From a paper:
Here, we report the structure and biophysical characterization of the Aer PAS domain, making use of the triple variant that combines all three flavin-stabilizing residue substitutions (S28G, A65V, and A99V); hereafter, called, Aer-PAS-GVV. The structure of Aer-PAS-GVV was determined to a 2.4 Å resolution by using a molecular replacement probe derived from AlphaFold; the structure contains two molecules within the asymmetric unit. The PAS core of Aer-PAS-GVV forms the FAD-binding pocket and consists of five antiparallel β-strands (Aβ, Bβ, Gβ, Hβ, and Iβ) and several peripheral α-helices (Cα, Dα, Eα, and Fα). Flanking the PAS core are an N-terminal coil that extends across a cleft in the β-sheet to the Gβ–Hβ loop and a C-terminal helix that sits above Gβ, Hβ, and Fα. S28G is on a loop between Aβ and Bβ, with its carbonyl oxygen hydrogen bonding with the amide nitrogen of H53. The A99V substitution increases hydrophobic interactions to the dimethylbenzene ring of FAD that likely serve to increase cofactor stability in the pocket. The side chain amide nitrogen and carbonyl oxygen of residue N85 hydrogen bonds with the O4 and N3 atoms of the FAD, respectively, and the imidazole ring of H53 forms π–π stacking interactions with the FAD pyrazine ring.
The primary energy sensor for motility in Escherichia coli is the dimeric transmembrane chemoreceptor Aer (aerotaxis receptor), which responds to changes in oxygen concentration indirectly by monitoring the metabolic load of reducing equivalents in the ETC. Aer is dimeric and composed of a cytoplasmic N-terminal PAS (Per–Arnt–Sim; named for the representative proteins: Period, Aryl hydrocarbon receptor nuclear translocator protein and Single-minded) domain, a helical transmembrane domain, a cytoplasmic HAMP (histidine kinases, adenylate cyclases, methyl-accepting chemotaxis proteins [MCPs], and phosphatases) domain, and a C-terminal coiled-coil kinase control domain (KCD) with high homology to those of MCPs.
Residue numbers in the entry: 8 to 134
């Protein structure tokens, strides 16, 4: 199925990746919503969650901003294990340890559907 899974108001997905984007930890809500357990996520890139409809230009601008040491945010469409889609607004922030960017943490809330209708014409003009 490709249908939408409506998320609750308190939905707060949080995860941590290394400098190459491979997941190092994931909170319990990310495990429940994504359908993947913690051990299946650890040591895996964050693209197993990526929905194929998401443009390449969205992630290219994120890593350009992240590699500059700056935080990034945007409306993201994700994919579950069964394959249902759910929109979020990712808030990826570079993690700094001893003056060095050690990784990136992100807190993903539920996307208001009005942010979806504003990027869908832009997303089909991006990829
Ligand atoms: C903390 C964190 C949380 C994330 N959460 C999500 C999430 O919830 N959903 C989601 O879909 N993605 C998420 N991502 C992005 C994920 O890691 C992938 O980069 C994304 O899915 C795109 O990878 P891809 O190979 O599928 O597409 P690609 O074809 O690789 O993406 C297009 C462009 O992305 C750029 N890019 C991707 N990875 C890198 C990299 N490591 N270094 C430099 N440039 C790069 C390249 O310029 C490339 O041309 C997250 C990343 C981080 C760091």
């Amino acid at each position: 199925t490709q249908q939408n899974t409506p998320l609750a108001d308190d939905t707060t997905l949080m995860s941590t990746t290394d400098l190459q984007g491979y997941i190092t930890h994931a909170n319990d809500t990310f495990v429940q919503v994504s359908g993947y357990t913690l051990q299946e996520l650890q040591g895996q890139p964050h693209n197993m969650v990526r929905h194929p409809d998401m443009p390449k230009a969205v992630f290219a601008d994120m890593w350009f901003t992240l590699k500059k040491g700056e935080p990034w945010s945007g409306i993201v469409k994700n994919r579950r294990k069964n394959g249902d889609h759910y929109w979020v607004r990712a808030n990826v922030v570079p993690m700094v340890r001893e003056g060095k960017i050690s990784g990136y943490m992100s807190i993903r809330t539920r996307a208001t559907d009005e942010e979806i209708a504003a990027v869908e014409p832009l997303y089909k003009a991006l990829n």
